[PDB]
Design a protein around this ligand. Structure first.
Ligand SMILES: Nc1nc2c(ncn2[C@@H]2O[C@H](COP(=O)(O)O)[C@@H](O)[C@H]2O)c(=O)[nH]1
Ligand SMILES: Nc1nc2c(ncn2[C@@H]2O[C@H](COP(=O)(O)O)[C@@H](O)[C@H]2O)c(=O)[nH]1
Ligand SMILES: [Mg+2]
Ligand SMILES: [Mg+2]
Lengths: 458, 455, 458, 455
C-alpha cells in the first residue's frame, strides 16, 4: 500500500488547524459494489411501486461495470455521455446501445455540450453509477413500447425522485444497519491515522448528512474495534455535525441545533457553538465561532457537491477529495504500462514518418520535381503499416479499462470532464482517507508542473 | 514555433480568416500602447474634466502585464489562476497584503460572471491597467474630486471606445505608419505559399475599409511585384466585421464597391470581394463548406469564449505576441527549473520512505528515524520554495509570468488552452510551416502517466 | 366611424415633437385574412420542401377563425393556451382538440404558467394567428404517426424557422408586390391625417423593417393617390428609416447607413443624421442627433416587440399601438350588449340570493334553530334556477365571439395575457392609425380610473 | 370590509394559516415603527461607528409611505407605478426635479431585477425609508465620513436584520406589551366561530416559540374563559417558520415539546402540536388536502411573488393596515372624485364632437367651429388636472396614496392584486364574516364594458 496523495494545488498542512471529515464514504468506507447494488434495487423497486412503471423493470439486472463514474445524463434525449474537460463528447450511448460518430453529430450538431443547460444532469454522487445503469435500461424499455413509459426527460426526473426518497425514507439506512458487515469496511489504519494527526495538535470534526442516531451506530461499529481499552471514539472528534445538509451547509445560512448526546433531543443554539454534537448549521458560523481563518480548515469529501463555483465562492475552506475509483484506475494503468510504452514508441515513429513525408511532399511541390516521388510512395505505405500497428495496440490498451467507457480521468488523450471537476474542487485527492492520514500532519503539498505546450520539456 | 492544444490538419482547412490589426499586420506594441495611453488620459481630462494632474502621469510599459483583471468596485487589479483564484493583487500601484486581501475578499475566488469585474483581453489591456492604477493611485489623495473606483473604470472604458471610433487613434497612426506598423516580408511570402496550395485567405477586421486599404497597401505591397495588387492575396475582405457578434450573431452583409466605397444590400450568396458587417453563419454556408474547414486567427480573446465556441464551430487560432519574452525568460530560467525538478524528485523519494515507515509502525505497532526523515523533507522543501523565488526574477518583477498564476496556470493560460487549437508568437510562424502540415497536440499527458511505473 | 382612441396612460400630444410610424400594418393597412393566408401557405410550403415533412401537410386547409390573437404556444407539449394577465390558463388545446379541465391540471400541475420558461412561445407578431393554426394541425398529424414527424418542440422551431425565412426570402414581398390591390388597403383619411398633424408642426418619420426598394413602392401605391397634383409622398416624412431591425433598433447600437434615394446605394454615416432615407440605425443616436428628449417622440406599431421590459427600459420613447382586431371585438361586444346586460341583472339577483342564503344558514347554525329551514331550502332551488338561467345566458354570450377562444382582451372575467401586454406597452391604442390622426395633434390623453376593489363606485 | 381580487369559497377552505406578528396579533404601528427606528440608528452609531450626529435624527412617521423603493446606488427613494415607472422621486428628504430625474435615470422605468434596488415590503419599510433618507441627507455634508450611498443602505439592512435576531427588539416589546401590542376581543371570537364551523387554524410565524407563547397569552387569553387555553384555538403552531422559504423550499420540520421547548427530528407525518421550521409541501401532504383548501394570511408580501405563487399553490390573503387611512381619505375626497368623473364625461363628449367634425371635413373637404371646440376641450382639461391636484391634499403630502402612483395603480397595488385573493385592513374583518361565505370579485370589469353602448 503506497498511500499516494495527488496534489493539484499547494496546501500547507502545517497551517491547517481543523480537518472536517465527511462520514459516509470518506471517514467510513463502504463496499462500493454492494452499496451501489442496494441503491439500484431500492430505487428500481420504488419505481415499480410508487410510480407504476412496467412490471418488466423488476426483471432488470444490475451489472456494476455497465457504467463508470463521471458520466453525464442527457435527459432530453435519453442518452449518457463521456465528456472531456471542456465538454467535448468523447463517446455516447442511447440507453445501452452506443451511438455512432455519424449519428452523434446529427443529434448534437456540435462536439461540445453546454452543461449550463438544465437538460443535462452532471451531478457527482454516490449513486451516479447506479443512476446511469438504471436510466440506460429504462430508456431501452421505453423504446420498445414508447407509450407504456413516460418521456426520457420524465424518466430521469422520476428516477432522481426515487433516489432522493430512498435517501430520506431511511429504507437504505435500516438495510445497511441490519447488515453492517456486508456494507461497511473496517480499517485499523484510519483510527491510527486520526490519532496520529490529533497527536500533533490537529482538531478533527465530522460533517455528515446522516442523522446522529445513525452516525453514532456506524462510528462505533467502524472505529471502536481499534481503540485502546477505555477510549471512546468520541475523543477522536472535536465536533460532530449531523444532518449537515451539504452543500448548503457550506454556503447557506441554516441554523445549528445542539444535540443531547444521550437521548438525542435538540435545543436551538444561542451564542457560539462549543465542542459537542450538533445538527444542521453553516460554515460561516462554524468558522467564526472557532475564531480561525477559513483557509485554516480542510474539509474532505467523496463526491463533488454539484456547482464547484458557488461553493468555492461563498465558503473559502480548503477542500480535498477521496476518489474510491482511483483504486482500479491505477491498477489498470499499471497493467497497461507495457502497452502504453509500446504505443508511445509507435507514435514517435509515426510522427517521425509523417514529418519527413510532409516535407518531402512540399519539396516536390515547391520544387516542381518528381525525384522524391519514389520515397514519398514508400513513406505512404510505411505510415499505413505503423498506423495499423497502433490502431491495434490501442484496441489492446482498451481491454485494460471498462469496455464501454474507458478511463474515469481520461476522455481520449485529454482529461475527462470528471477529471476537471476533481482538479477544480480538490487541492489534493487520494483513493482513501488513510492515504492522507499516513502522511505527516505537517506535510507541505506541492503540485508537479503541468507543462504548457510552449514549455520546454526537461 | 507553433504550439498545439488540439489537432488540426491543415490539409483539411480550405479557408484561413485573418484578423487585420495585430495579427496579419504587426504593430510596434510599445509605441501603440502608449499612443492609446496618451489619447485616453487626454480624453479624460477633457470630456470628463479629470484633475489636470493626470497629464503628468508617465507610461511604463512594464507596470502591467497581459491577462490581468480589473476590480472596478474596489479599484484593484487582480491576477487570477485558471479557476478564478486571486494569486496576486494590487490597489492602484500598491500591492495588497496577504492579510489585507483576506479582509477585502471573503473568498480567494472571484466570479467573473459579476459584471463588476473587467476581464476583457484587448490590445489595450496593458494601457488600461497602468492608467487605471495611477488614476486610483492619485484618487485617494482626495476622494471628492475623481469619481468612484467603479465610475473611473467605466469612464476610462468609454474613452478607449470613443477614441477608437472618433478616428482619433486611426488618424494618428495613418499619418505616421513608419512609427507604428512593422513590415515583414515573411508574411506575404507565407500567404502566397498557402494560396499556392489551394488555401483561400480572407480578412476579418473591426476596422473601416478606408483605413484597411491604407494599412494593407503600406504593409504588404512593398513585398509585391510591380502590378501585383495586395488585394489579390485575399479571396474576401470583410470590414467593420463587428466582432465578436460577427461570429454568433446574425447581422447582414453589405457589398462594398472597392472603387467609390458606397455599399449595396446583399441578395443571394456572397462572392469574392469586399464586404462590411456580416456573420459567420451566412459566410460558411455561402462558401459551401463546414465550419471545421475554416481557420480563423486573431490576437485577442474577444468576449465570452463559450458563446463564441458553442455557436461558431470554426477552428480558431491565436497569435500571442507576449510569447517572445515569456519564452526567452523561461529559457534563461531553464537551469533553475531543472534544479526544482530534481528537488521535487528527491522530495517524493523521501516522503515515500516516510509514509512507508509511518505505515510500517502500524503493521507492528524506530521513533526517531522518522524525525531525521521529516528534517530532510523540511530542508528540501525550503530549497524548493527559495528556488521558485529565485526563478521570479527572470520575469516581470511586478506580476510574474503571463501563463502562470503562482504555481498554477493563469486564467489567461486557460483561455488560450480553451480558445486556441494552435497558438504562436506571430502569424508568420504558422505561415512558415508547410500548407499541408498536420499539427498534433503534445503527448505530454501520455508520458505524464509514466508516474504509473513509479509503482 | 367613431375613430376612438383608448388610453392606458397620460400622453400630452402637445409635447410630442416627432411621431415614428411602423410601415407594414400601421401606416399602410393590409387585408388581414388574405395576408395571414399567404403567410400560412408560404410557410406550409417551405416545410414540405426544405424540411421534408409528410406530403399530407400540403392538404392542410386554412381557416382564419381556428385561432385568435394573443395565444401562447407550449412547444414542449404541442399545446396552445389562452392566458390571463397573470398567466392563468383560461383554456387550452392540444392541436385542434380541446383539453378538458381535468387533463389540464394533470399536464400543468398548476393553473399558472411561467412565460419566463423558454418552452413557451408568446411573441405577438403579424403571423401569430397563422402560426397557431398551422402548429395546431401539425401536432394533429404528428399524433397520427408519431414517427413520420419530429417532436412537438422540433415542429414549433421548424415552423418558426420557415416564418423567419419566408420573411427574408423576399418570397412574401414579391407576391404582395405583384398583387397589391389584393393585399394592401388604401385609405384617404391616413393622408389627410398626416397632413393634419404636419400642419400643426408635427414631424413624422417612418421606421420599418422592410427594405427601401419595397417601401418606396408601397408608400407610393398607398399614399400618392390622395396627394394634390405635384405633391410627393416623401414630403409627408422627415425621415424614413428602413431595415430598421426592430426591436433591436430601440435598444441595440447598430449603425445607420445613408441611402441614396435614387439608386439605393448606401454610405456609412459620419456625424449627425439629417432628414432623408436611411437603413438600420438605433434609437439612441436618432434621438441625440435630433436634439430632443426621448419622451418627445411617439412610436406607433402594430405588434408587441417580444420583451416589453428590455425595450421600455433602454429606450424611453413613448410607445403607442394599433390593434387591427379591435374592429371585430368592439363589433361583437355591441352585438352582445343586450345579453351582457341580461347576464348582469341575473348575476345581481344571484348574489342577492346567495347572501341571504349564507346569512340564513349561519343563523340556523349560530342560533341552533330550524325555523329558517323552510326558507333555506327554497333559496337553494331558486339559486339552482337562476344558476341555470345564467349558465345558458353565458353559452349564448359565447356565440358572439370566436367559438374556440372567446375574446382577445378577456380571459374569463379578467384580462387576457394579451390585454396585459397591450396595457404595459401602449400608452394608447386604437384599431387603426387614422383613428389617432383624426384627433387633435394637441390632445391631452387621460385614462379613466380603473377602480380598485377597495375603491367606492360612483 | 373584505376586498376581493379573486374568487374564494370559504366552504372549501379546511385550514387557515395565520401570520402571527402584525396579522393575528396587532401592534401599535406608530410605536413599533419608532422602536425599530431607534434600535437601528442606535446599532449604526456603534457596530459601524456612524457620525454621532445621527442620534439627533427625529422620527416622523409621515415622512415615508408603504410601497416605496430604495435606490441604493443613487441614494434615492422611488414610488413606482405597477409597471416600474418612476412617478415620484426623492434624494434623501429632497424631492428630485422632473428635469434632474431625467439626467439620473435614462428611462423612467427601473428594473427591480437589478439587486441594486431594495423593493421588499416589510413591517419596517417605513422606518427604513425615513432613516435612510436622513442618513443620505446628512451624508452629502461630508462624503468622506459616512460610506457610499449603496454602502449605507446595506448597513442599515444589516442592523434591522441583526436587531431582529439579537432579541433586542423582542425583549423590549416583551417587557412592555401594553405599549406595543393591541388586544381585540373580536379576533378570538371570530377564530372560535370559524373553529365552530370545522375550520382548522394554525400559526406560521418567523418568531421563536418562547416569544410566541408570551405574546399569544397576552393578546388572546384575556378573551378566554377560565381554564380555556389559547393553544386550543390552534391545530398547529409552527415557529421559526423561516418564511418565505417555508413556502417553496424543503427545510425540515422539528417537533417542539411544549413543555421544555427541546426538539426532536420528525419521522412520519406531522400531527397537531408545536413545530419549528418545516415547509408548505410536507404540511399540505401530511394533512391530506389540496393546496387550494388552505388559506394563508400574512401582512407583508415577503420576497418574489412569482416564486411564491408558482411553487406554493396555497390560497393567500393579505392584511394591509394602511387601508384604514387610505379609505377614510378617499371618502373625504369623494366629492372631488365625483367632479373629476363628470368633467371626464364632458371631455369625452366634446372630443367626440371634435373628431366628428374633423372627420366630417374629409367626407366633404366651418373651420372655426372646431376652434371654439378645441377651446372648450382645453378648459375642461385644465379643470381636470387642477381637480386631481385638489385631490392630492387629502393624502400623504409627500408621497400621495399607497395604491396609486400618479394616475396609475402603484407597484404595491399590483403586488396586492397579484398576491392576494382577498385583502382587508385587519384580520378580524375577515373573521367577522360567515365561515361559509363565498367571496366574489367585483364585476367592475363587467360594467366596465358598458362603454360599448356609448356606440
Ligand atoms: N475557469 C475554468 N472553467 C472551466 C475549466 N474547464 C472547464 N471549465 C468550464 O467553465 C465554466 C464556467 O464558464 P466561464 O465563466 O469560465 O466562461 C465551468 O462551470 C466549467 O463547466 C477551467 O479549466 N477553468
Ligand atoms: N410589473 C408587472 N408585471 C406583470 C403585470 N402583469 C403580469 N406581469 C408579469 O410580471 C413579469 C415580471 O415579473 P416581476 O419582475 O414583476 O416579478 C412580467 O414579465 C409579466 O409577465 C403587471 O401588471 N405588472
Ligand atoms: Mg460522503
Ligand atoms: Mg408593422
Amino acid at each position: 500500500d503506497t498511500h499516494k496523495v495527488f496534489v493539484n494545488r499547494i496546501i500547507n498542512m502545517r497551517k491547517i488547524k481543523l480537518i472536517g471529515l465527511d462520514m459516509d464514504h470518506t471517514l467510513i468506507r463502504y463496499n462500493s459494489k454492494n452499496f451501489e447494488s442496494l441503491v439500484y434495487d431500492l430505487v428500481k423497486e420504488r419505481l415499480a411501486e410508487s410510480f407504476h412503471y412496467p412490471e418488466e423493470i423488476k426483471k432488470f439486472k444490475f451489472n456494476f461495470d455497465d457504467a463508470i463514474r463521471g458520466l453525464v445524463i442527457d435527459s432530453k434525449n435519453g442518452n449518457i455521455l463521456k465528456l472531456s474537460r471542456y465538454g467535448a463528447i468523447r463517446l455516447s450511448y442511447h440507453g445501452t446501445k452506443q451511438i455512432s460518430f455519424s449519428d452523434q453529430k446529427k443529434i448534437y450538431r456540435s462536439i461540445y455540450v453546454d452543461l449550463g443547460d438544465p437538460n443535462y444532469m452532471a451531478i457527482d454522487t454516490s449513486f451516479s453509477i447506479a443512476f446511469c445503469i438504471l436510466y440506460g435500461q429504462l430508456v431501452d424499455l421505453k423504446d420498445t413500447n414508447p407509450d407504456k413509459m413516460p418521456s426520457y426527460q420524465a424518466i430521469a426526473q422520476d428516477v432522481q425522485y426515487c433516489v432522493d426518497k430512498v435517501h430520506s425514507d431511511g429504507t437504505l439506512k435500516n438495510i445497511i444497519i441490519k447488515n453492517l458487515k456486508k456494507y461497511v469496511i473496517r480499517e485499523k489504519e484510519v483510527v491510527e491515522g486520526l490519532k496520529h494527526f490529533i497527536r500533533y495538535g490537529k482538531k478533527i470534526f465530522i460533517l455528515t448528512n446522516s442523522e446522529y442516531s445513525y452516525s453514532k451506530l456506524l462510528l462505533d461499529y467502524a472505529l471502536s474495534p481499534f481503540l485502546d481499552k477505555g477510549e471512546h471514539w468520541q475523543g477522536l472528534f472535536e465536533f460532530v455535525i449531523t444532518l449537515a445538509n451539504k452543500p448548503r451547509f457550506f454556503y447557506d445560512n441554516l441554523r445549528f441545533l445542539s444535540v443531547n448526546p444521550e437521548n438525542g433531543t435538540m435545543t436551538n443554539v444561542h451564542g457560539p457553538i462549543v465542542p459537542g454534537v450538533y445538527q444542521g448549521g453553516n460554515a460561516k458560523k462554524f468558522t467564526e465561532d472557532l475564531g480561525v481563518g477559513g483557509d485554516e480548515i480542510l474539509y474532505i469529501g467523496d463526491h463533488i457537491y454539484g456547482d464547484i463555483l458557488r461553493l468555492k465562492k461563498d465558503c473559502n475552506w480548503r477542500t480535498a477529495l477521496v476518489v474510491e475509483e482511483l483504486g482500479e484506475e491505477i491498477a489498470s494503468q499499471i497493467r497497461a504500462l507495457p502497452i502504453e510504452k509500446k504505443i508511445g514508441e509507435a507514435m514517435a515513429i509515426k510522427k517521425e514518418l509523417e514529418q519527413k513525408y510532409v516535407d518531402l511532399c512540399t519539396r516536390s511541390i515547391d520544387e516542381s520535381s518528381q525525384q522524391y516521388d519514389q520515397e514519398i510512395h514508400d513513406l505512404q505505405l510505411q505510415i499505413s503499416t505503423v498506423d495499423l500497428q497502433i490502431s491495434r495496440l490501442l484496441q489492446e490498451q482498451n481491454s485494460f479499462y471498462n469496455p464501454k467507457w474507458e478511463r474515469v480521468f481520461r476522455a481520449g488523450a485529454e482529461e475527462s470532464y470528471f477529471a476537471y471537476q476533481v482538479d477544480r474542487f480538490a487541492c489534493i485527492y487520494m483513493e482513501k482517507l488513510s492515504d492522507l492520514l499516513e502522511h505527516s500532519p505537517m506535510t507541505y503539498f506541492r503540485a508537479n508542473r503541468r507543462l504548457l505546450a510552449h514549455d520546454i520539456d526537461i
